[PDB]
Design a protein around this ligand. Sequence first.
Ligand SMILES: CCc1c(-c2csc(N3CCNC[C@@H]3C(=O)NCCCCO)n2)[nH]c(C)c1C(C)=O
Ligand SMILES: [Mg+2]
Length: 103
Amino acid sequence: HSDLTFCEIILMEMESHDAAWPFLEPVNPRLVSGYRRIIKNPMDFSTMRHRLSRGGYTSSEEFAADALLVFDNCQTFNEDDSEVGKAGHIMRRFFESRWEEFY
Ligand SMILES: CCc1c(-c2csc(N3CCNC[C@@H]3C(=O)NCCCCO)n2)[nH]c(C)c1C(C)=O
Ligand SMILES: [Mg+2]
């Protein structure tokens, strides 16, 4: 049940990644017009860190579900050629590759 250890490794690496800047904190819907209306389930790296710190993950699969939610939301709201969108593609490819070179 120490897939949570690899969750720790991968989350540390995403948190320190250069392209992680759009995802370190929750999006503030007061500052982003339309975000609340379009994104039903917001997610971000600090929320995953908090959930992991309090033992809120029962398996690596739901951790991965939150991670993929970050980048699904990113691609849903932001254009692929937007700055946040580009960072999201870099981060998504990073997560998929790291997650697969363990499982
Ligand atoms: C595009 C908003 C965004 C971010 C995000 C996090 S910091 C940031 N920066 C700050 C400095 N340069 C401009 C840009 C910005 O516009 N900051 C105001 C909005 C911050 C509300 O929290 N952008 N991350 C995701 C997943 C986003 C969206 C819309 O999906
Ligand atoms: Mg693939």
